[PDB]
Design a protein around this ligand. Structure first.
Ligand SMILES: N#Cc1ccc(N2CCC(CCC(=O)NCc3ccc(N4CCCCC4)cc3)CC2)cc1
Ligand SMILES: N#Cc1ccc(N2CCC(CCC(=O)NCc3ccc(N4CCCCC4)cc3)CC2)cc1
Lengths: 193, 193
């Protein structure tokens, strides 16, 4: 039941490795899921709601992993705490690159994709700013920019850089170098005076 | 002659303040330019080639201003040299926000918009990396990350942050704060050890 639903999601994610949402039909999704076209429409109002759900699941998987990290701190130096947190996004979205690239293209046309994006970007920026403020209160980082504006620009940087890398856009940081590159920019901008 | 062409460009830019490319018709563009629809097609193969040209002009205006800056250095402290260079992008794209937002949405669907983007992003990253390498050779900045990977991530950050600000996306750095925010991240990541 939820079984046919998972099959429809697994098929869309496999086909999105191969072509854009525009070149995938509902019949392709039903064919791969082993169901009819009207049975598809029982589970999803459209192929776009299928993308929306896949993106929702990827975003919630990152959010949950971050929640886990936050509750039980990886005890390590400061550099490593930031590395570990950015790696959540690198590994989560990096394990679903076709969803990430399709979700990105859809932010342009879909009001629901734009809102899901915006809700989670705000949540992760607020968390990031809470960590920078924690570090400033303990005296580990200087009071330079407003924490919240710093956290917005660093999160936007990661979103754009991670996503260019995963799509291999011209130009982009190679995926094997993108984590070191981001952590250097984060640690220097947060701790630097 | 080039006169009717400018009129068609000026009309598209005015209408793009109001609605997306999808909600602008060739007849709207011809109506605003004071010409017929077939006379439009003489100058532009499509409304999309009109957007492509407007974006091309905005990108070339930024590039030329940067070329001017590069030939005659604004003599000032290091922080100010970076501020002045990023301000080229803030002022240029910031003076054509509807073109910038429409061009951005089109990168998703248009192969020619994607290539224009990619050509100039590479050129400005290469220039940025040349400046970081100049600073390292003179001993003013430490050899930390590869200059070119650092320059890719900082340019991607600016592209994403400037464009979110100009569109007032939720979330974004307020436009009155975005220049200070970026220059802090640049100067700390470039000079910080
Ligand atoms: N639709 C959609 C959608 C919504 C949001 C998206 N993204 C927004 C933000 C992007 C980058 C954010 C990002 O890279 N966040 C960095 C971050 C998060 C948490 C932490 N810590 C350190 C201490 C312990 C853990 C907490 C440190 C750094 C990743 C992609 C992307 C897509
Ligand atoms: N289509 C298209 C398209 C193509 C490229 C686009 N962008 C790409 C890069 C974005 C940000 C780049 C950006 O902000 N560049 C920063 C930069 C450039 C030059 C310098 N200097 C300092 C010393 C003297 C002058 C030279 C310093 C910083 C701005 C938007 C945007 C759209």
């Amino acid at each position: 039941g939820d079984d046919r639903e998972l099959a429809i999601l697994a098929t869309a994610e496999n086909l999105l490795e191969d072509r854009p949402l525009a070149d995938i039909s509902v019949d392709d999704l039903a064919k791969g899921a082993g169901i009819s076209r009207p049975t598809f429409y029982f589970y999803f109002p459209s192929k776009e709601a299928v993308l929306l759900t896949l993106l929702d699941r990827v975003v919630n998987q990152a959010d949950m992993a971050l929640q886990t990290l936050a509750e039980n701190p990886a005890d390590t130096d400061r550099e490593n705490m930031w590395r570990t947190g950015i790696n959540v996004f690198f590994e989560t979205f990096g394990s679903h690159k076709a969803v990430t690239r399709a979700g990105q293209a859809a932010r342009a046309t879909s009001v629901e994709v734009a809102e899901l994006w915006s809700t989670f970007m705000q949540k992760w920026i607020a968390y990031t700013a809470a960590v920078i403020d924690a570090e400033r209160d303990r005296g580990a980082a200087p009071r330079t920019l407003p924490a919240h504006e710093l956290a917005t620009a660093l999160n936007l940087m990661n979103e754009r850089t991670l996503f260019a890398s995963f799509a291999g856009e011209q130009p982009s940081v190679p995926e094997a170098r993108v984590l070191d590159t981001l952590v250097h920019i984060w640690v220097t901008s947060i701790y630097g005076e």
